[PDB]
Design a protein around this ligand. Structure first.
Ligand SMILES: [Cl-]
Lengths: 240, 235, 241, 250, 243, 244, 195, 231, 111
């Protein structure tokens, strides 16, 4: 079998294949996560270079791993499917053996572990994907939001963004997100998430996707018109 | 290109030497061994204020009598920790006893040189392994990706290590109390860290014979930081 | 330019490692010749023992593959013995599986196929040898089949191999143009060996003693090599007319 | 030891070219000309027996090969590569078809199997592509007579008539002027001999030309009588004398 | 160029340069020889005394295979040991299936094919030794010499290592002056002389002589080391000839 | 050893791109153009054969349009031999699903499976990727008529109208101009042929240079029919739409 | 375990399963639920060898839940039953086969029809208006053959089921400690808590 | 140069550079001495610390009751090779009820090291070993190189500055070989030998490591205050 | 049919005192009604102040004692010459025995 060490150290102590995988993430469409007091919102950018697209059937950017946890990503689309499938299988395996659904931290730790493994195994390249994993632990009302990257490191975030122009939207979030008082309602959280994407997106039309996750497996994706109403209200307050 | 297991003209393995450079870029970790216990402390180094810092886990329990702190590519440490935990538990299963701290360290270090064309590269992380056993008392070890491990009275690893080690050279003596060691780790971490040290960007832990391995609360560490500030202002 | 190191195509559709294996074939500086009689097939080869410390009885490039099949090799002795051992193993296995002696042309095809694989698979190098197989086949009669590092093979009325193969080939061509038959019209193998040695002397322009030659003879149901004294008797008969 | 070449030796270059396949096609271009023509009641395939030495017995080297009783093959390019492909093609006709369905494969499907083998030598680890192009002629009950070309990439195409190798460009133009959908087998053989004469330098006779047909069933070549449904092979290699007879009416 | 960077690659000459480089390691080694006598074979080797701290007679170089074959080599000593280990496996499997001890020509090809196999791939390195070996079987005495390429022939006398040219010349004199043959006891004496004479190419350090033999009359066709009085007698004969 | 000759087919560039995937896409841009158009009452697949000959046996020839099952077909752009390897795997996957669940495989599940196979060759194994892009035309009872595309990276997307192969930039602009949501199959047939007629590198678009297929519920009642057009039928539809 | 029954009426499928678990000499439990929900509108009851029953049922449940998440879609009862049949047909030629018999009761939301499938440990599948495993059918089928109508209400189905259980309690030698009854219809799965 | 990329490549002069580079790792290692009489065999080793807070790296490893070694170079490689020796000593005792001869132990170490010098993918061992033992033919001392070369000696030294100790032993050869039935005097000779390799630093109580095996003496290692008697 | 087991007889006895312990056994070895040996030691000093006897099928008994003595040796190698305590030895012997759960050592062991 093909055993070639593709991920190796360089004289300055860098693993370039892992670092180049991060450059693939930089190219991917922007993804953002914001947790309120009783919810988490995942926002995603859709590049409008592709019209004549069939939006009914085209792969959506946010994926349910279980009924209570969701995963979004920035980077190689094909690579992300492999991580999503593995995470979904592990979620069902956990329910089968522990008789309890995965915690958000456990699912994050698993996906991050798979990513790390692909950085020191022979004959494989690292995933060109960073992920945002959000949801609620079983029988818990505390919001959870984690981030993973190609190297396999992971951490928890009050709010975070990944992908192209994520430096700009992180700038916005760092001055607009208060830890002592997070977005108290679904409305406030969605509004802050749409606002953060409007710093980068272009037209607020079919370019912004929004998914809201609440406790006890309550997950819903907002439609074009619902998001369009947030887009309308934000700019009418801005004209002042 | 060239083999992953190649020797340099000086008789050193290229990949091992390069992984040591990655560890130099890692956040600082410090350990101090006393006759009352061993203290372990780390710099958390969050990349952004929106990152919830209590999710940064650079100090980890291996068993009740053995703790561990890391510096470098911290994702690489996860399989090393998994192996260490498995080895500690397996020995207890086979022998109805605690494993020696040195034996645990040796088992972790056996993984290090298992790379080639086994894993595709060495680990990019260094570990400080601290613990207690009945035969050799309180112990602190430094485990490297070369497979070598040294025992230390005190040791610092990561980006601020050589400045910290010089400081540990002057401060350590064989009569240090546990309280004195805690303040000493805080003092030296504060010296080498970029950002100002507080209970949210630094973490303390210890291992004692009585209570075992414990990660300190942010409230407990905050008091020790206040105690440090006052005694430095006392002269 | 790693297309020259392993067996992959060059921009001209050539395999350089195969071409260089053909060049290794002439490293021993030895010439061989094969001809067919009515009842036999004869192969002769030059024998050179350049060191006095050598045991001359062990210096040989003719091999007894099976009872019926003989093989002469042009190329270095390590690769020659590699091919010899494999041919012996293949011939023995064939007899075990199919219940009859492996034909000369079938063994040639099998060794040619193995050689073809070395030209297509990168991890294996070509053998730097040309193999001339001889026998008196029970269906086809006297047979000469020759294999090379490209995996090519074909039957021959007669053939020659080595640094001076062209001189011997043309000499043989001219004889068969006169006689207008595909073989040496002679009853005994002794006279077919004499024909073979005579025409090698003519083509190379050199005289031979008993220790300068190596001879293999195939008849119905056996292949054998001649001793120095058997060759001497052959040389005496050539000189006496 | 162990084969440590587990990686592809054929890869895409910046321009999108697969170098090793292009170079294999170059080797085919240097090869001796071979052709095929399809008639209403048969198919003919032909090539030159380019003898490497006059001491060599060129009858022992078969450029036109029977794959099944109703399918034959000819090539241009590297001879040894062709020989092993004929071995693999003969075996796969049995292992992946005859041992399953109790009958020989139709021409198009055997071609498909040979094509797959050639494709894999273009992607699998530690190997180079085959340096040959094949022309495969055959007949089967439901598809009738057919003729196919297979290239080093593994691509294959059906033809009414075509040529490959050395003088293929000129030969294909010659075939375009002469071919029609009303040709009888004897007419196709006549055209094949006319076309092949243009690319041959030296001797042009039954001993230097190799020619075979896919035509009527030959009960005389079956080897047994008694089963009405078994009527014999449609593949037949023409003799040296049969070729020379048609060279007088040339 | 680049043809010499990888084993099994043919150069435009039709040469395997990696094998030719292995020969250089052989030529760098100490001198070892072999002499075929009337009813057996004698092997001798030069052992360089690098220091006084080397224990005399302890670091034995000549190796036995089965009970009737002796092996000596020049070049990389570990490579030679690896080849003898394989030879011992080949001899054991032959005797297991066929009962009779492996004939010397049969044993020669087993070593030959194994060494040749290490010239077929780039994933292995050629052997850095030339091996002189032989013994007595049912057809009499046999002496062989095997090169890094896998090439081997039978010999009347053989030599390899740094002082091979000197040794070869001495061996050629013995072949000419004794067409009828040499006795086993004579061959031991002559072997001692030739090693002492060949030591001129290694004259900086002093050396230790080591001799072994297999003879039908003297050792019952078994391989034995020359020891004690017979060794001293050969050393005295050798010292007398150099003065 | 062997490392010397390894091209390393599964590595990132400094910009975070996959060399071999990018180069395979370059190869596909020279292949004959294939077009898919989805209508309310069916799907059209139209594709151009590459510079042909008069001696090519067209009526038995297939290089562009392939049947995966009774409900799903594909149009190919790239290496035909590479495509047939993947096509046979897809045919097997469809039958595996039918055996397991006793229902025809949904279109997207088949598409995802083939796309994952393509992905694997870009991440592990050290082999070259498949130089193929597919247009999938299919029907199932969940989403109805569907069009997808996949490329050597293993990425796939859904479309109302799409092109692959040569001159996709020009083709996509022409499709984007004339496509409407309430369009019917007979209108889509015309659009596909008109688009090929304008984007082709040949002098004129004739029957012998085309492969054509429709997937219609124009099958008597509650079922779907695949129609791979014959040479004479391509000739007739060219006259009907007024191109010849 | 022991008795499992099923009946498909106009608008629902009803599954009845015994509560007893007996380990040789003693009845260890009298409240055991011999069923697993595979999807919101599909229920599977089971009986056979100890351990293998729950292991097989939970394995199937895990697989259907995995499919549901992957596709965001509920498989039809027919599709689920075919998947289960193949797993048992595979198992019967294994080193150690699953000794498990199942009934699958599902409501098809596409066709708006209840469906009942009976599958034994060999992988023998049949679609039925009513079914059973073991000796349960020997006592109950004559009653079902007489009274069953395809247009029965859920309440009428429960009443016919009560008559079947009463006949079992009369003529069966083993005490199966009553049955747990569950209904599968357009609104999902619910348990009848008084039976 | 162009021929040092892997162990499977000879240079044009017939050298193996990867093996030579592995030999270089031994020269960087701390000094260790070996010497023997007719009754006893002794190892003396200068241990190296990382700094003043650190421990001194152990140099001597026990392989059996009658055999053990000292190391210089890559310590993990010594652990692999000493583990192999422990297994081979153990196999000999379990299967044949026989203590493994020191000479045979040397042959086994040679062959294990050789395989890593002729194959692709692998690397040579980066450590040198001094093996002492007492078997059926008396006291023995062996020197192991990762080239595969194993040599039996009266005395020797490996590591940095080992040449000074080696010359001293070459002078004292006739004296220390005669120290029979006196373990303390043989160790004294070894401590005096290793002293000829010291610069700037001297032998302290946590610096010095001594091992001994003999006629009625199991292989035992002395560290700490147990070597103060010899300082 | 081949029977891999046998019975070598013998009787052993272990008694624990306040600050001492004894392990005793008879020295007779038998098969069926024959005496193999009148003195064949059955109780063994295994090092670290531990004594052991595995009574029953003597081949399995010798194998187990041999493997435990070996385990003591490797415990010293792997754990810095730490003394193997009696409780640790007992747990270790359980794993030696259960490793052949489906082809057992036909013995009754006492330490
Ligand atoms: Cl073959």
């Amino acid at each position: 079998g093909y055993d070639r060490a593709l991920s190796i150290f360089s004289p300055d102590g860098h693993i370039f294949q892992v670092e180049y995988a991060l450059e693939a993430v930089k190219r991917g469409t922007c993804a953002v996560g914001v947790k309120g007091k009783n919810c988490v919102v995942l926002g995603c950018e859709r590049r409008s270079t592709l019209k004549l697209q069939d939006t009914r059937i085209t792969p959506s950017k946010v994926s349910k791993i279980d009924s209570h946890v969701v995963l979004s990503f920035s980077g190689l689309n094909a690579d992300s499917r492999i991580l999503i499938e593995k995470a979904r299988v592990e979620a069902q395996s956990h329910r089968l053996t522990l008789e309890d659904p995965v915690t958000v931290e456990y699912l994050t730790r698993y996906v991050a572990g798979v990513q790390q493994r692909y950085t020191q195994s022979g004959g494989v390249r690292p995933f060109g994907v960073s992920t945002l994993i959000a949801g609620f632990d079983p029988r818990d009302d505390e919001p959870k939001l984690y981030q993973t990257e190609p190297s396999g490191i992971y951490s928890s975030w009050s709010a975070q963004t990944i992908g192209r122009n994520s430096k700009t939207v992180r700038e916005f979030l760092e001055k607009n997100y208060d830890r002592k008082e997070p977005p108290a309602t679904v409305e406030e959280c969605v509004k802050l998430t749409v606002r953060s994407l409007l710093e980068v997106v272009q037209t607020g039309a079919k370019n912004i996707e929004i998914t809201v996750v609440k406790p006890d497996s309550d997950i819903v994706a907002l439609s074009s018109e619902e998001i369009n109403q947030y887009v309308t209200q934000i700019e009418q307050e801005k004209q002042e | 290109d060239r083999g992953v297991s190649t020797f340099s003209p000086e008789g050193r393995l290229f990949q091992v030497e390069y992984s040591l450079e990655a560890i130099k870029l890692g956040s600082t970790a410090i350990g101090i061994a006393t006759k009352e216990g061993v203290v372990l402390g780390v710099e958390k180094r969050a990349t952004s204020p929106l990152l919830e810092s209590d999710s940064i886990e650079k100090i980890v329990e291996i068993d009740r009598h053995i703790g561990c702190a890391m510096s470098g590519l911290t994702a690489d440490a996860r399989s090393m920790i998994e192996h260490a935990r498995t080895a500690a538990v397996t020995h207890n299963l086979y022998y109805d006893e605690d494993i020696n701290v040195e034996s645990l360290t040796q088992s972790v270090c056996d993984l290090a040189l298992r790379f080639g064309e086994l894993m595709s590269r060495p680990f990019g992380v260094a570990l400080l392994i601290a613990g207690h056993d009945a035969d050799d008392g309180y112990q602190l070890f430094h485990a490297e990706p070369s497979g070598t491990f040294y025992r230390y009275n005190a040791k610092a690893i990561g980006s601020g290590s050589e400045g910290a080690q010089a400081e540990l050279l002057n401060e350590w003596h064989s009569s240090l109390t546990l309280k004195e060691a805690e303040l000493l780790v805080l003092k030296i971490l504060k010296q080498v860290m970029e950002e100002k040290l507080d209970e949210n960007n630094a973490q303390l832990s210890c291992i004692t014979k009585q209570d075992g391995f414990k990660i300190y609360d942010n409230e407990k560490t905050a008091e020790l930081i206040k105690e440090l500030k006052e005694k430095e202002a006392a002269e | 330019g790693y297309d020259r190191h392993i067996t992959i195509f060059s921009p001209e559709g050539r395999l350089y490692q195969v071409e260089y294996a053909f060049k290794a074939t002439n490293q021993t500086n030895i010439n061989s010749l094969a001809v067919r009689g009515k009842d036999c097939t004869v192969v002769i080869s030059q024998k050179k023992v350049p060191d006095k410390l050598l045991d001359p009885t062990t210096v040989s490039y003719i091999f007894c593959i099976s009872r019926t099949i003989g093989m002469v090799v042009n190329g270095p002795i390590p690769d020659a013995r590699n091919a010899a051992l494999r041919a012996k193993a293949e011939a023995a296995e064939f007899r075990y599986k199919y219940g009859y002696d492996m034909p000369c042309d079938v063994l040639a095809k099998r060794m040619a196929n193995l050689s073809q694989i070395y030209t297509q698979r990168a991890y294996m190098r070509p053998l730097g040898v040309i193999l001339t197989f001889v026998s008196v086949d029970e269906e086809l009669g006297p047979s000469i089949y020759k294999t090379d590092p490209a995996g090519y093979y074909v039957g021959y009325k007669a053939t020659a191999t080595g640094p001076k193969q062209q001189e011997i080939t043309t000499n043989l061509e001219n004889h068969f143009k006169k006689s207008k038959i595909d073989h040496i019209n002679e009853e005994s193998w002794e006279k077919v060996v004499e024909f073979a040695i005579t025409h090698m002397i003519d083509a190379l322009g050199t005289e031979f003693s008993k220790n300068d030659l190596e001879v293999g003879v195939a008849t119905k149901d056996k292949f054998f090599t001649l001793s120095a004294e058997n060759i001497e008797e052959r040389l005496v008969a050539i000189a006496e007319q | 030891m162990t084969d440590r070449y587990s990686f592809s030796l054929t890869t895409f270059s910046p321009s999108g070219k697969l170098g090793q396949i292009d170079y294999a096609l170059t080797a085919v271009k240097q090869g001796v000309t071979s052709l095929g023509i399809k008639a209403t009641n048969g198919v003919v395939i032909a090539t030159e027996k380019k003898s490497s030495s006059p001491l060599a017995m060129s009858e022992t080297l078969s450029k036109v090969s029977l794959l099944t009783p109703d399918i034959g093959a000819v090539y241009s390019g590297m001879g040894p590569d062709y020989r092993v492909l004929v071995d693999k093609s003969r075996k796969v006709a049995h292992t992946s078809y005859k041992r399953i369905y109790g009958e020989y494969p139709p021409t198009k499907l055997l071609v498909s199997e040979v094509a797959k083998i050639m494709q894999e030598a273009t992607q699998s680890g530690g190997v180079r592509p085959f340096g040959v192009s094949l022309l495969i002629a055959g007949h089967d009950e439901f598809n009738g007579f057919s003729l196919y070309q297979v290239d080093p990439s593994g691509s294959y195409f059906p033809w009414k008539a075509t040529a490959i190798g050395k003088g293929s460009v000129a030969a294909k133009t010659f075939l375009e002027k002469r071919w029609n959908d009303e040709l009888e087998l004897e007419d196709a053989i006549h055209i094949a001999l006319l076309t092949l004469k243009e690319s041959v330098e030296g001797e042009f006779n039954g001993d230097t030309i190799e020619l075979a047909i896919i035509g009527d069933e030959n009960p005389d070549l079956l080897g047994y009588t008694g089963i009405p449904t078994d009527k014999g092979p449609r593949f037949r290699k023409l003799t040296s004398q049969e070729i020379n007879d048609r060279l007088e009416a040339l | 160029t680049g043809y010499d960077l990888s084993n099994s690659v043919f150069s435009p000459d039709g040469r395997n340069f990696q094998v030719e480089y292995a020969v250089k390691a052989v030529e760098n080694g100490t001198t070892s020889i072999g002499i075929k006598c009337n009813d057996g074979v004698v092997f001798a080797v030069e052992k360089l005394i690098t220091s006084k701290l080397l224990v005399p007679q302890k670091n034995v170089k000549i190796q036995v295979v089965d009970r009737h074959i002796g092996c000596v080599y020049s070049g990389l000593i570990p490579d030679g040991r690896h080849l003898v280990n394989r030879g011992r496996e080949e001899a054991a499997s032959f005797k297991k299936l066929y009962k009779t001890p492996i004939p010397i020509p049969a044993f020669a090809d087993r070593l030959g094919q194994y060494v040749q196999a290490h010239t077929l791939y780039n994933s292995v390195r050629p052997f850095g030794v030339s091996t002189i070996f032989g013994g007595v079987d049912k057809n009499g005495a046999h002496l062989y010499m095997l090169e890094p390429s896998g090439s081997y022939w039978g010999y009347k006398g053989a030599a390899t290592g740094k002082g091979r040219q000197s040794a070869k010349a001495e061996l050629e004199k013995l072949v000419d002056h004794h067409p009828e043959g040499l006795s086993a006891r004579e061959a031991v004496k002559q072997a001692a002389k030739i090693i002492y004479l060949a030591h001129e190419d290694n004259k900086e350090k002093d050396f230790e002589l080591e001799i072994s033999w297999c003879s039908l009359s003297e050792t019952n066709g078994l391989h034995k080391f020359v020891k004690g009085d017979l060794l001293q007698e050969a050393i005295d004969f050798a010292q007398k000839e150099i003065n | 050893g062997s490392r010397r000759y390894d091209s390393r087919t599964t590595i990132f560039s400094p910009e975070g791109r996959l060399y071999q995937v990018e180069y395979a896409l370059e190869s596909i841009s020279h292949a004959g153009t294939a077009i898919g158009i989805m209508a309310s009452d069916g799907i059209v697949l139209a594709a151009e054969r590459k510079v042909t000959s008069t001696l090519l046996e067209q009526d038995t020839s297939t290089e562009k349009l392939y049947k995966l099952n009774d409900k799903i077909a594909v149009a190919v752009a790239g290496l035909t031999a590479d495509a047939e390897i993947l096509i046979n795997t897809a045919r097997i996957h469809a039958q595996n699903y039918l055996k397991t669940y006793n229902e025809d495989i949904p279109v997207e599940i088949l598409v995802r499976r083939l796309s994952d196979i393509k992905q694997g060759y870009t991440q592990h194994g050290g082999l070259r990727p498949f130089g193929v892009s597919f247009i999938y035309a299919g029907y199932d009872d969940r989403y109805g008529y569907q069009l997808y595309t996949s490329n050597p990276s293993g990425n796939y997307t859904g479309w109302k109208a799409i092109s692959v192969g040569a001159n996709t930039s020009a083709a996509q602009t022409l499709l984007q101009m004339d496509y409407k949501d309430d369009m019917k199959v007979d209108d889509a047939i015309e659009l596909a042929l008109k688009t090929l007629s304008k984007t082709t590198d040949s002098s004129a678009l004739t029957y012998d240079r085309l492969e054509f297929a429709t997937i219609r519920k124009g099958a008597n009642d509650g079922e779907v029919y695949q129609k791979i057009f014959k040479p004479q039928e391509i000739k007739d539809i060219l006259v009907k739409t007024g191109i010849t | 375990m022991d008795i499992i029954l099923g009946i498909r009426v106009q608008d629902s499928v009803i599954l009845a399963s015994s509560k007893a678990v007996t380990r040789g000499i003693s009845v260890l439990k009298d409240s055991d639920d011999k069923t697993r929900q595979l999807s919101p509108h599909t229920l599977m009851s089971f009986a056979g060898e100890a351990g293998d029953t729950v292991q097989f049922a939970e394995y199937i449940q895990a697989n259907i839940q995995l499919y549901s998440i992957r596709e965001d879609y509920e498989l039809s009862p027919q599709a689920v039953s075919s998947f289960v049949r193949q797993e048992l047909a595979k198992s019967i030629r294994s080193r150690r086969p699953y000794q498990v018999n199942v009934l699958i009761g599902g409501y098809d939301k596409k066709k708006n029809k209840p469906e009942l499938y009976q599958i034994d440990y060999l992988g023998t599948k049949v679609e039925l208006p009513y079914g059973a495993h073991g000796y349960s059918g020997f006592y109950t089928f004559s009653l079902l053959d007489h009274h069953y109508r395809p247009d029965m209400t859920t309440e009428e189905g429960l009443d016919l089921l009560k008559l079947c259980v009463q006949e079992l309690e009369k003529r069966m030698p083993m005490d199966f400690k009553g049955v747990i009854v569950k209904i599968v219809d357009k609104d999902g799965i619910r348990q009848v808590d008084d039976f | 140069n162009n021929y040092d990329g892997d162990t499977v490549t000879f240079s044009p002069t017939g050298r193996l550079f990867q093996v030579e580079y592995a030999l270089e790792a031994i020269k960087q290692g701390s000094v260790t001495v070996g010497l023997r009489s007719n009754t006893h065999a002794v190892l003396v080793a200068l241990k190296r610390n990382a700094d003043e807070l650190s421990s001194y790296q152990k140099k001597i490893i026990k392989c059996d009751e009658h055999m053990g070694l000292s190391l210089a170079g890559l310590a993990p490689d010594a652990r692999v090779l000493s583990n192999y020796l422990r297994q081979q000593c153990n196999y000999s005792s379990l299967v044949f009820n026989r203590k493994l001869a020191v000479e045979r132990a040397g042959h086994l170490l040679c062959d294990k090291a050789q395989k890593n010098t002729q194959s692709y993918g692998g690397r040579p061992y980066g450590v040198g070993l001094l093996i002492i033992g007492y078997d059926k033919s008396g006291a023995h001392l062996l020197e192991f190189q990762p080239s595969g070369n194993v040599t039996e000696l009266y005395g020797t030294a490996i590591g940095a500055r080992s040449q000074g100790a080696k010359t001293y032993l070459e002078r004292t050869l006739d004296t220390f070989i005669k120290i029979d039935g006196n373990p303390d005097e043989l160790i004294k000779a070894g401590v005096e030998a290793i002293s000829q390799s010291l610069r700037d630093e001297s032998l302290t109580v946590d610096n010095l490591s001594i091992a001994i095996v003999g006629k009625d003496t199991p292989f035992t290692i002395y560290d700490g205050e147990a070597v103060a008697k010899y300082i | 049919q081949f029977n891999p087991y046998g019975d070598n007889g013998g009787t052993i006895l272990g008694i624990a005192g306040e600050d001492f312990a004894v392990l005793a056994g008879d020295t007779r070895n038998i098969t069926d009604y024959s005496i193999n040996s009148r003195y064949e030691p059955k109780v063994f000093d295994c090092g670290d102040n531990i004594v052991m006897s595995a009574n029953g099928f003597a081949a399995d008994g010798d194998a187990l004692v041999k493997r435990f003595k070996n385990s003591v040796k490797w415990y010293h190698f792997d754990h810095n010459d730490k003394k193997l305590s009696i409780n640790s030895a007992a747990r270790n012997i359980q794993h030696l025995l259960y490793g052949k759960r489906f082809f057992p050592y036909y013995v009754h062991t006492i330490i």
